[PDB]
């Protein structure tokens, strides 16, 4: 359910939140259905910020789980979902800090009821193509997968150009992770390449 | 009241130290208590060595038992009992206070509004452990660490002040046991969370630095030598005399030469007996470093025993032992032949990333982008009539 | 019992008390089984006394009512199993004694109990249970108060070879003088069984790190003649602990796994999936630091 929210960005310490509204609404919803608890708050995008962490503290207050921060991107980019999930995780870590609060991504997928699924299908004149059911559908998917892979690689390629030539700092921890990508690469012209050839034949 | 106490502090003291007692009294009259708290701080910063320091505490704690913030108050006592030469007295004062803080919290809650009060208690238990250790009781401190650690983890966070004292006790305990490995972890954290106070003397910080350098010479999986010299703690003390040859053992290790290392160590083994008892670990350590380094800067995945033996100055008999310890420590992975006498490397340990290596990463990603984009163009032309 | 009619005496005790277990207090039943069991160690039939022990149940024997009796029950079980050299089993029993309330609370009395366990636990052969129990003993604070026991646990827990004549000499005046396991006349005949665990341990380290090694070099590391070396290899492969293949002209000893196309295709699948996962994960952090800075 919606809250009113005003953001002033002159000072990221100036914020509007209707406190009373939240408590009132929490109690009414419980009388329809008791399985509704405060599990977080959505932010409307259209990107992540460094600023979402000031706001997150306000929602830890209410909750008995770490609040889920759903960055719903509202112009809708991607051939996938434009919905990111982040839950604030607290762990001791040294990258210039002693205790870090950071947000770890979690997968977004869907699950639906009988009623809700049929209501989606009912809107849609589509036969789906995120299904990976038939031969036809899996063909479409394989090409979408290749296009997904090229676009992310640019984002990685540009990030690295910006340290070395647009001067952001050298972040050992980030690079470190990148290094292993290269270390765990396949290498052909070895018997490994040969096992593949024999495999092709069988199928 | 405070008047009789104030006279008694001035008399036994020096003329230089009369105006310090006078500043406090003034804040008290006006009742500005932000300023009173700060002015106590100037006191314990650099005159915790005066014999009156402990009594001066005793009037202020009674007044501000529940009026101002608990972290503030407690802070004075701890510094006062770091300057006592008699630790039997130190243990008694803590034991009373520990007792007061358990009563206090009943009262204190209603005054603040609603607040914690386990803050003072955590610091007191650390001081009991540190008194024990300066008196050489390893065990009494030992059960105090366990119980103290769990209470850190119970909270979502501990303050930087509180956690420095906890890490203060841990450092003290470890260097007596003579575990280099354990001492190392406590010191790197101590610098991160280090108090912004000038109340922690520079003399302690220097001493702590010397011992840190020693942990990493004798260490077992520490290949962070370059990293140690970046941080302010070592960087600035390079041109001190006793910390010259000490950092030259860091730098010899880095570049992987054996002659600079040999010429240094023969002098300091004799001079300082610390390097004598851990001699067995010290010689091996170079050998291991040479191995890793030659492997990392190159891009090939195998080396014969002949290349290795010249590099490390060991015969091919000891080289197979050298390889076994490296794989075991977690520096490298691979397999060993004695029938072709190769070491086959398959894993390298990610180390410090230099500016040059970022460029290097990037070049390969551009190679792979093009390849994907090319394939995907062909895969559109193919299958054009069969898609959803 | 004092007379030469000790035999006839047991046969009467064990028969009687093994059919009489009615309405009488538990504390008394526990007592009569101990007495029965005691005679049977003298009978030379350890198997009779194993069956008896399993009459008394572990559901009714974790109470303070039975505390002094629990300790003696477990001391006897160690004697039964020591005859038959099940060392891992001896170690389990002894562990319960340590975890008993009485021994744990009295500082002095816990000292010998811990020490005995270390000993027996190392004489066990290298199984799935050996690996998890020995790393339980290594972590404990008590182990760390001691240093004599610490050195032994540390040797086997690390994945480093070590030569027989050197472990022997080193711990002969420290650990081998103490009673239980080591010490006495019959117990010195378990010092021997140690020599086999140390050479087969060496072989366990060498399978993992070496893939080809010479038969010639292998002889030197275990400190055993050609004939002996091949024997303890063969014995290990019947136990299914290692994979070893020796060429008898002294060519290669192979520790490297025999491969199939299927195993290999699985390994390579892992690596690819793993790449795709890393690219995304590094990709989350790339977003944070881009907007932020």
């Amino acid at each position: 359910f919606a809250l009113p929210f005003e953001e002033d960005e002159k000072n990221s310490d100036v914020w509007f939140l209707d406190h009373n509204y939240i408590e009132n609404m929490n109690e009414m919803c419980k009388k329809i259905n008791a399985k509704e608890k405060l599990i977080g708050w959505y932010h409307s995008g259209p990107k992540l910020r460094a600023s979402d962490l000031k706001i997150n503290e306000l929602f830890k207050k209410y909750t008995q789980n770490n609040p889920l921060l759903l960055i719903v991107d509202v112009k809708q980019q991607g051939v996938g979902l434009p919905t990111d999930a982040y839950v604030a995780i607290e762990q001791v870590k040294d990258d210039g800090t002693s205790t870090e609060k950071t947000f770890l991504h979690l997968p977004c997928t869907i699950e639906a009821e009988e009623a809700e699924e049929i209501g989606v299908e009912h809107l849609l004149r589509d036969v789906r193509d995120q299904a990976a059911g038939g031969l036809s559908i899996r063909l479409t998917n394989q090409l979408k997968s290749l296009k997904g892979l090229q676009s992310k690689l640019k984002d990685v390629v540009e990030y690295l150009d910006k340290v070395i030539n647009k001067e952001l700092p050298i972040n050992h921890t980030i690079l470190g992770k990148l290094q292993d990508v290269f270390n765990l690469l396949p290498n052909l012209g070895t018997p490994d390449d040969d096992e593949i050839d024999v495999e092709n034949h069988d199928r | 009241e405070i008047d009789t106490i104030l006279s008694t502090l001035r008399m036994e003291a020096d003329p230089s130290l009369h105006p310090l007692f006078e500043q406090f009294e003034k804040f008290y009259e006006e009742k500005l208590w932000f300023q009173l708290s700060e002015s106590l701080t100037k006191f314990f910063d650099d005159a915790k060595s005066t014999p009156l320091r402990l009594r001066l505490y005793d009037n202020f704690v009674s007044k501000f038992y529940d009026k101002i913030n608990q972290l503030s108050v407690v802070k004075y006592l701890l510094a006062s009992l770091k300057d006592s030469k008699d630790f039997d007295e130190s243990l008694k004062y803590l034991d009373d206070l520990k007792a007061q803080f358990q009563e206090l919290d009943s009262k204190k809650q209603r005054n603040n509004g609603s607040k914690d009060h386990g803050d003072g208690i955590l610091l007191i238990d650390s001081e009991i452990a540190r008194t024990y250790l300066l008196k050489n009781d390893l065990v009494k401190a030992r059960d105090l660490l366990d119980d103290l650690e769990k209470t850190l983890d119970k909270k979502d966070s501990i303050p930087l002040r509180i956690t420095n004292s906890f890490y203060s006790t841990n450092s003290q305990y470890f260097k007596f046991k003579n575990d280099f490995n354990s001492f190392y972890y406590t010191s790197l954290l101590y610098l991160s969370t280090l108090e912004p106070s000038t109340s922690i003397t520079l003399a302690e910080r220097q001493q702590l630095a010397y011992d840190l350098s020693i942990s990493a010479l004798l260490g077992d999986k520490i290949y962070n030598f370059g990293e140690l010299l970046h941080h302010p703690i070592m960087e600035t003390i390079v041109n001190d005399s006793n910390y010259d040859w000490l950092f030259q053992l860091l730098n010899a290790l880095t570049v992987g030469d054996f002659d600079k290392f040999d010429s240094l160590i023969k002098v300091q083994i004799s001079k300082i007996p610390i390097l004598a008892q851990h001699e067995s670990f010290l010689r091996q350590k170079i050998c291991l470093m040479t191995l890793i380094e030659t492997v990392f800067v190159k891009n090939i995945r195998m080396l014969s025993f002949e290349d290795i033996s010249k590099a490390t100055h060991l015969p091919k008999d000891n080289v197979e032992h050298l390889v076994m310890r490296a794989i075991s420590l977690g520096l490298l992975k691979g397999s060993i032949d004695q029938v072709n006498e190769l070491v086959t490397i398959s894993w390298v340990q990610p180390r410090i990333i230099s500016g040059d290596q970022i460029t290097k990463m990037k070049d390969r990603l551009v190679e792979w982008n093009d390849q994907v984009e090319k394939l995907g163009k062909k895969m559109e032309a193919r299958g054009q009539s069969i898609w959803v | 019992k004092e007379e030469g009619k000790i035999d006839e005496a047991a046969d009467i005790l064990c028969e009687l008390q093994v059919e009489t277990y009615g309405s009488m207090e538990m504390s008394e039943k526990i007592q009569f089984i101990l007495e029965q069991m005691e005679l049977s160690i003298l009978k030379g039939d350890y198997s009779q006394a194993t069956v008896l022990s399993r009459k008394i149940l572990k559901k009714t024997f974790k109470n303070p009512k039975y505390e002094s009796l629990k300790l003696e029950y477990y001391n006897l079980l160690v004697k039964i199993s020591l005859h038959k050299r099940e060392y891992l089993e001896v170690a389990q029993y002894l562990q319960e004694i340590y975890q008993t309330d009485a021994i744990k609370s009295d500082e002095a009395k816990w000292k010998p109990v811990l020490s005995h366990i270390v000993y027996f636990l190392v004489l066990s052969p290298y199984g799935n249970l050996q690996n998890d129990l020995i790393h339980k003993i290594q972590n404990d604070n008590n182990l760390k108060k001691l240093e004599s026991q610490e050195s032994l646990v540390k040797l086997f827990t690390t994945n480093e070879l070590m030569r027989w004549p050197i472990v022997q000499k080193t711990y002969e005046p420290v650990l081998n003088e103490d009673d239980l396991a080591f010490g006495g006349e019959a117990n010195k005949h378990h010092w021997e069984d140690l020599q086999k665990r140390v050479i087969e341990h060496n072989l366990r380290v060498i399978s993992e790190y070496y893939s080809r090694i010479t038969l010639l070099r292998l002889n030197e590391l275990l400190d055993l003649t050609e004939s002996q070396t091949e024997t303890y290899i063969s014995d290990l492969v019947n136990q299914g602990i290692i994979y070893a293949k020796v060429n008898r002209p002294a060519k290669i000893v192979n520790f490297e796994k025999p491969k199939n196309s299927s195993q290999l295709l699985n390994e390579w699948s892992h690596n690819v999936d793993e790449l795709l996962e890393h690219i995304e994960t590094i990709g989350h952090l790339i977003t944070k630091e881009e907007i932020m800075h």
Side-chain angles (χ1 to χ4, degrees):
Chain A
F1 288 111
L3 296 186
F5 204 92
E6 272 197 70
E7 188 70 76
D8 185 38
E9 291 178 288
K10 187 174 181 292
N11 296 305
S12 287
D13 295 316
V14 169
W15 59 68
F16 177 69
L17 185 58
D18 196 297
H19 200 289
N20 284 16
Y21 184 121
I22 303 179
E23 305 301 312
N24 291 301
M25 201 53 80
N26 281 357
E27 295 311 307
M28 280 274 256
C29 301
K30 291 179 183 66
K31 306 179 187 62
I32 314 161
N33 188 36
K35 295 190 174 43
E36 296 182 84
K37 295 284 183 304
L38 212 151
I39 73 174
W41 53 298
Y42 68 95
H43 160 249
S44 39
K47 54 188 190 172
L48 172 65
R49 304 177 298 179
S51 309
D52 290 327
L53 290 74
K54 290 84 184 196
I55 328 187
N56 204 270
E57 284 301 291
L58 293 165
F59 291 87
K60 186 178 302 208
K61 298 177 179 305
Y62 309 130
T63 60
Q64 55 161 357
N65 56 102
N66 290 303
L68 165 55
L69 160 75
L70 206 65
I71 299 174
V72 171
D73 302 307
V74 279
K75 300 294 162 47
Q76 305 161 81
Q77 286 292 284
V79 294
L81 285 175
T83 316
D84 322 299
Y86 282 105
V87 180
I89 38 156
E90 311 166 82
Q91 50 187 353
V92 181
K93 183 172 168 199
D94 294 299
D95 189 18
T97 49
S98 181
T99 319
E100 196 173 299
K101 167 186 176 297
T102 198
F103 275 124
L104 160 68
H105 190 257
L106 294 178
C108 304
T109 324
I110 54 79
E111 189 163 314
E113 299 177 25
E114 180 176 65
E116 302 180 67
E117 185 169 86
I118 287 276
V120 169
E121 272 295 289
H122 176 103
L123 288 162
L124 291 163
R125 303 171 175 201
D126 293 89
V127 310
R128 286 187 271 182
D129 62 344
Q130 302 295 61
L135 194 58
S136 51
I137 307 190
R138 284 188 310 194
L139 285 146
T140 296
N141 289 72
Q142 174 51 246
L143 174 63
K144 288 203 301 300
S145 297
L146 304 174
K147 305 296 196 176
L149 181 68
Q150 76 172 298
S151 303
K152 173 68 57 164
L153 270 160
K154 279 168 181 303
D155 296 321
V156 199
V157 163
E158 64 96 44
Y159 177 95
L160 304 173
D161 185 79
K162 295 185 289 80
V163 180
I164 57 183
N165 186 255
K166 301 195 176 39
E167 306 294 315
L168 283 50
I170 295 169
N171 306 104
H172 303 271
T173 304
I174 324 183
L175 287 149
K177 295 161 64 34
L178 223 160
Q179 184 188 106
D180 300 302
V181 170
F182 295 121
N183 200 93
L184 294 161
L185 203 61
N187 181 285
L188 312 176
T190 53
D192 191 298
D193 181 46
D194 202 72
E195 308 317 68
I196 326 297
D197 191 51
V198 188
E199 182 57 4
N200 302 331
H201 306 157
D202 287 329
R203 300 179 298 174
Chain B
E1 187 282 291
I2 185 159
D3 299 283
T4 32
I5 314 171
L6 193 72
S7 300
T8 57
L9 286 167
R10 296 183 298 194
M11 294 149 59
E12 310 270 295
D14 309 308
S16 313
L17 298 160
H18 294 3
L20 320 169
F21 302 120
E22 299 188 76
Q23 300 179 304
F24 299 123
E25 185 58 85
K26 288 190 195 287
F27 292 121
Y28 205 56
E29 302 178 284
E30 297 186 316
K31 316 195 86 184
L32 304 182
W33 290 356
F34 192 53
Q35 305 282 340
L36 196 146
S37 199
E38 301 186 64
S39 62
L40 293 156
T41 309
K42 281 179 206 74
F43 203 93
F44 291 102
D45 203 313
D46 67 302
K48 45 176 196 158
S49 297
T50 55
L52 283 320
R53 80 297 170 176
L54 199 62
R55 300 198 292 127
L56 173 72
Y57 178 60
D58 306 315
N59 62 99
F60 299 112
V61 64
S62 314
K63 293 181 165 180
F64 312 132
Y65 69 115
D66 45 18
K67 294 178 171 83
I68 79 189
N69 194 264
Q70 205 184 46
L71 187 58
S72 305
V73 191
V74 62
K75 186 161 174 296
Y76 320 122
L77 187 51
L78 308 162
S80 306
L81 290 176
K82 270 160 177 64
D83 275 295
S84 192
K85 299 293 173 297
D86 305 293
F87 302 96
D88 298 292
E89 178 178 45
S90 308
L91 190 68
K92 187 40 58 183
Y93 249 86
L94 302 157
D95 298 343
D96 295 322
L97 212 71
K98 174 162 172 56
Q100 185 183 100
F101 288 11
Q102 293 168 205
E103 297 290 302
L104 178 67
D105 33 67
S106 309
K107 320 181 186 182
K108 185 158 173 65
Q109 190 161 266
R110 311 183 305 198
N111 296 133
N112 296 332
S114 189
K115 218 190 70 68
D116 197 89
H117 308 277
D119 309 301
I121 332 192
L122 308 165
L123 291 155
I124 288 161
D125 286 63
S126 310
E127 197 59 66
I128 293 171
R130 291 187 286 255
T131 67
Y132 282 141
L133 285 170
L134 265 158
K135 295 196 291 287
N136 307 340
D137 301 73
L138 306 167
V139 203
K140 295 179 181 173
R142 195 186 305 236
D143 61 290
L144 282 168
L145 295 183
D146 297 301
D147 271 49
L148 200 40
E149 182 173 314
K150 283 170 191 48
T151 314
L152 311 185
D153 284 299
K154 178 161 62 205
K155 294 182 191 306
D156 311 68
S157 184
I158 187 81
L160 315 194
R161 279 91 259 177
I162 309 169
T163 206
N164 175 254
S165 308
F166 173 57
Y167 288 159
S168 293
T169 304
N170 294 306
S171 296
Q172 186 164 64
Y173 175 68
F174 298 132
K175 61 161 207 303
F176 298 161
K177 280 292 257 57
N178 307 123
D179 296 72
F180 24 87
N181 45 60
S182 289
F183 191 93
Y184 180 87
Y185 293 114
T186 319
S187 301
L188 261 61
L189 288 177
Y190 191 103
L191 184 76
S192 313
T193 205
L194 172 74
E195 312 180 16
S197 303
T198 320
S199 309
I200 308 306
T201 46
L202 294 180
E204 307 171 73
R205 302 191 187 177
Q206 295 175 276
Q207 190 49 247
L208 177 50
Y210 173 77
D211 295 291
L212 181 50
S213 178
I214 311 289
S215 307
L217 305 168
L218 297 176
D220 74 280
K221 58 183 61 162
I222 294 164
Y223 287 104
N224 297 98
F225 306 129
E227 186 167 63
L228 284 169
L229 279 162
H230 290 153
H231 301 172
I233 192 176
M234 300 304 188
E235 198 187 75
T236 67
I237 49 158
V238 305
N239 291 161
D240 293 287
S241 62
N242 291 40
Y243 313 127
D244 179 274
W245 44 268
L246 182 84
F247 289 171
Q248 288 180 292
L249 294 153
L250 301 181
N251 310 317
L253 257 150
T254 305
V255 302
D257 203 64
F258 281 77
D259 317 292
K260 171 164 170 167
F261 166 76
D262 285 335
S263 69
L264 290 161
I265 179 176
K266 303 304 188 295
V267 195
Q268 297 300 152
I269 205 148
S270 300
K271 197 173 162 295
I272 309 287
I274 315 177
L275 273 58
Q277 58 194 287
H278 306 106
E279 185 275 309
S280 298
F281 293 122
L282 204 48
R283 300 302 293 220
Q284 196 197 78
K285 189 60 178 183
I286 318 302
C287 300
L288 279 158
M289 181 43 186
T290 294
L291 192 53
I292 52 170
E293 190 56 89
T294 42
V295 161
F296 192 91
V297 294
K298 311 200 284 170
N299 288 110
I300 47 170
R301 295 273 67 163
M302 72 294 110
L303 296 164
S304 46
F305 289 0
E306 294 60 77
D307 300 296
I308 299 179
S309 294
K310 69 181 156 54
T312 58
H313 290 286
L314 279 173
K316 297 165 196 201
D317 294 310
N318 279 224
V319 157
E320 313 200 30
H321 306 85
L322 188 56
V323 170
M324 207 279 315
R325 291 297 296 107
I327 314 165
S328 196
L329 281 166
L331 327 173
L332 295 155
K333 310 284 167 73
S335 54
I336 314 168
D337 303 314
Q338 208 304 260
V339 190
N340 299 62
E341 296 186 285
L342 290 178
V343 62
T344 309
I345 307 302
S346 47
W347 186 62
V348 280
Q349 179 170 314
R351 298 177 84 189
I352 308 189
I353 308 304
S354 283
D356 180 280
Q357 297 186 0
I358 304 186
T359 304
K360 298 286 175 262
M361 279 190 192
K362 185 196 158 182
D363 288 299
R364 302 180 186 87
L365 294 193
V366 187
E367 301 180 74
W368 296 0
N369 181 228
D370 298 296
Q371 289 178 250
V372 175
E373 156 256 319
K374 183 189 299 191
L375 178 63
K377 170 53 188 188
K378 297 170 176 177
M379 292 181 68
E380 299 176 61
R382 288 183 207 125
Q384 191 54 249
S385 62
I386 275 299
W387 303 117
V388 172
Chain C
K1 201 200 297 196
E2 311 193 312
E3 313 300 73
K5 311 292 190 311
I6 192 160
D7 312 77
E8 190 158 294
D11 285 307
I12 285 160
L13 200 66
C14 296
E15 178 176 308
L16 199 130
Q17 297 167 6
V18 81
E19 69 183 33
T20 61
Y21 292 127
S23 299
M24 67 184 69
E25 180 175 345
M26 188 52 72
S27 301
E28 295 175 290
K29 291 180 197 198
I30 298 162
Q31 190 90 229
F32 288 128
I33 277 155
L34 301 164
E35 206 188 60
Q36 288 169 253
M37 290 176 70
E38 194 61 286
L39 293 173
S40 308
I41 299 300
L42 312 171
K43 193 63 63 64
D45 289 275
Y46 304 97
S47 309
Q48 195 172 9
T50 305
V51 160
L52 292 166
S53 68
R54 292 176 178 201
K55 297 292 176 278
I56 207 108
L57 304 170
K58 305 295 200 322
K59 183 178 180 311
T60 50
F61 211 182
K62 305 293 183 177
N63 299 292
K65 192 174 298 294
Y66 313 128
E67 211 84 339
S68 295
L69 309 170
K70 186 176 40 176
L71 288 172
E72 187 53 285
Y73 176 86
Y74 293 130
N75 299 351
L76 300 157
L77 289 164
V78 165
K79 301 168 171 64
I80 283 174
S81 278
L82 201 47
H83 164 61
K84 300 183 166 296
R85 308 182 181 159
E86 320 188 57
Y87 300 103
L88 189 61
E89 293 284 334
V90 168
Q92 187 49 225
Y93 294 150
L94 281 181
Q95 187 173 17
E96 317 284 359
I97 304 164
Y98 191 73
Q99 290 291 302
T100 301
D101 311 306
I103 313 297
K104 192 166 259 161
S105 53
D106 191 305
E107 313 287 302
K109 283 207 298 178
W110 65 265
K111 298 291 186 183
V113 182
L114 183 65
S115 314
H116 300 175
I117 296 160
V118 174
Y119 312 150
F120 290 112
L121 190 50
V122 170
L123 279 155
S124 304
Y126 300 102
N128 194 64
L129 293 151
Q130 181 261 341
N131 285 319
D132 62 269
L133 294 183
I134 208 171
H135 294 164
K136 196 196 175 294
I137 306 305
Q138 182 56 47
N139 295 1
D140 293 331
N141 301 91
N142 298 73
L143 191 73
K144 312 195 183 303
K145 286 180 191 75
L146 283 155
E147 280 182 63
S148 55
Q149 307 302 319
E150 173 66 56
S151 35
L152 201 63
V153 181
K154 188 56 160 191
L155 186 56
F156 287 89
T157 51
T158 59
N159 295 116
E160 293 170 50
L161 70 130
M162 58 285 175
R163 290 182 180 101
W164 182 258
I166 325 292
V167 175
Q168 196 179 16
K169 289 289 144 302
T170 303
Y171 310 110
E172 200 158 58
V174 200
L175 296 174
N176 188 62
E177 302 307 67
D178 193 69
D179 287 57
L180 282 302
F182 302 146
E185 189 57 86
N187 294 280
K188 184 182 303 300
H189 305 139
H190 296 158
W191 186 231
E192 303 179 340
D193 298 60
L194 195 51
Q195 182 173 339
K196 181 49 178 300
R197 304 288 183 292
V198 173
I199 60 171
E200 90 189 58
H201 177 273
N202 289 17
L203 265 164
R204 188 180 78 156
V205 170
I206 298 168
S207 298
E208 298 173 46
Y209 305 98
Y210 291 80
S211 47
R212 284 198 178 179
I213 183 177
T214 58
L215 181 57
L216 186 73
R217 181 67 169 191
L218 193 55
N219 297 312
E220 193 167 321
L221 302 179
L222 288 195
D223 298 290
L224 306 174
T225 48
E226 178 61 72
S227 306
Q228 299 259 270
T229 297
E230 298 174 345
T231 309
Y232 305 120
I233 309 167
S234 293
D235 299 316
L236 270 164
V237 159
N238 293 128
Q239 296 169 267
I241 310 179
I242 51 177
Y243 176 67
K245 285 301 203 171
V246 189
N247 295 16
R248 191 56 183 134
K251 303 186 199 190
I252 54 180
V253 184
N254 296 155
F255 295 99
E256 44 172 302
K257 296 289 212 181
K259 293 316 305 183
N260 308 112
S261 291
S262 38
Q263 301 184 251
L264 286 169
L265 287 152
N266 301 355
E267 295 172 63
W268 188 80
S269 181
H270 312 173
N271 291 320
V272 179
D273 311 320
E274 191 62 267
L275 290 188
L276 293 157
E277 184 61 63
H278 294 348
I279 290 160
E280 186 65 54
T281 48
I282 311 163
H284 300 313
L285 304 177
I286 273 163
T287 313
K288 291 187 192 60
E289 301 293 300
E290 189 186 52
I291 314 303
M292 184 154 167
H293 287 87

